[PDB]
């Protein structure tokens, strides 16, 4: 709401950070299956639920 | 990489001075990293960070040994200097407390101890 608590704001920062593509060299590692992730959250699609 | 055996030979004040120099240097490496930098300085950030840790460890080692010295042969010692086993082990009866016996029990063990014996066929 723009009226928000500090605790809420900290969580929003973290949520935005986890909402990023993985760098390719992570998936290029020998023995890694990080090629695609089901954790790509979008604001209209899947809600944070605080 | 600073050598820790060389660090232990220095006084606490000189170590505190050396630490400030390392922190000032680490701040410079980070500023340069933001405004473009080669890979040697990037590897120098990690080395400088570990050098700061080495100095902090020596300073703390020296301080703790001084505290152990100040509290040698004292009944009550700082908590972080006492045993760190388990909570239950700290509360257990001491071997001395466990081995206490009444006079009646002491006499019994003195006069009727279990013997060594054998049966010959």
């Amino acid at each position: 709401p723009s009226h928000k608590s500090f605790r809420t704001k900290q969580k929003l920062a973290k949520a935005a950070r986890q909402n990023r593509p993985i760098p390719q060299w992570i998936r290029l590692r020998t023995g890694n299956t990080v090629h695609y992730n089901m954790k790509r959250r979008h604001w209209r699609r899947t809600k944070l639920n605080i | 990489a600073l050598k820790t055996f060389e660090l232990r030979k220095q006084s606490q004040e000189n170590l505190a001075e050396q630490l400030q120099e390392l922190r000032q240097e680490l701040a410079s490496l980070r500023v340069q990293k933001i405004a473009g930098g080669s890979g040697s300085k990037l590897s120098k950030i990690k080395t400088t960070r570990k050098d700061i840790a080495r100095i902090l460890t020596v300073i703390n080692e020296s301080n703790r040994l001084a505290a152990r010295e100040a509290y040698k042969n004292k009944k009550y010692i700082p908590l972080d200097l006492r045993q760190k086993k388990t909570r239950a082990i700290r509360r257990a009866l001491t071997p001395y407390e466990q081995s206490r016996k009444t006079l009646k029990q002491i006499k019994k063990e003195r006069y009727f101890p279990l013997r060594k014996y054998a049966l010959k066929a």
Binding site: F6, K9, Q10, L12, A13, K14, A16, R17 | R23, Q24, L26, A27, S28, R30, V31, Q32, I34, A35, N60, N63, R64, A67, R68, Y71, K74, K75, Y76, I77, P78, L79, D80, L81
Partner: protein, 118 residues
């Protein structure tokens, strides 16, 4: 033993202060957040550059637990300049940004160059 009030109150007694037989903590901790923790890095975005050369103000990434008092002292101790006002904001990424305006007797551009982020 004259009581002129119908209310008994607890009499005052000595209340000694603590005289421990041992310090609970052997070694006092060094100052947390002195000056190398308070100032994390200069910020050199385009908007920060305009703040430097138009309003004589520096932009710093600072520790979340720094306040306007400690940011002022840290800048004075680290870069030997005297801020006149400090404004602070917590960015949407969760990190703290400080707008450090310098006095009219110092040039922010020169300070920026001396730090080396220009």
């Amino acid at each position: 033993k004259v009581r002129t009030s119908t209310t008994f109150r607890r009499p005052k007694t000595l209340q000694l202060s603590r005289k421990p037989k041992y310090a609970r903590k052997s070694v006092a901790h060094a100052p947390r957040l002195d000056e190398y923790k308070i100032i994390v890095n200069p910020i050199n975005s385009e908007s920060a550059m305009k703040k430097i050369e138009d309003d004589n103000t520096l932009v710093f990434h600072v520790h979340l637990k720094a306040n306007k008092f400690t940011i002022k002292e840290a800048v004075r101790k680290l870069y030997s300049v005297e801020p006149v006002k400090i404004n602070t904001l917590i960015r949407p990424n969760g990190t703290k940004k400080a707008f450090v305006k310098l006095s009219a007797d110092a040039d922010a551009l020169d300070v920026a160059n001396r730090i080396g982020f220009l």
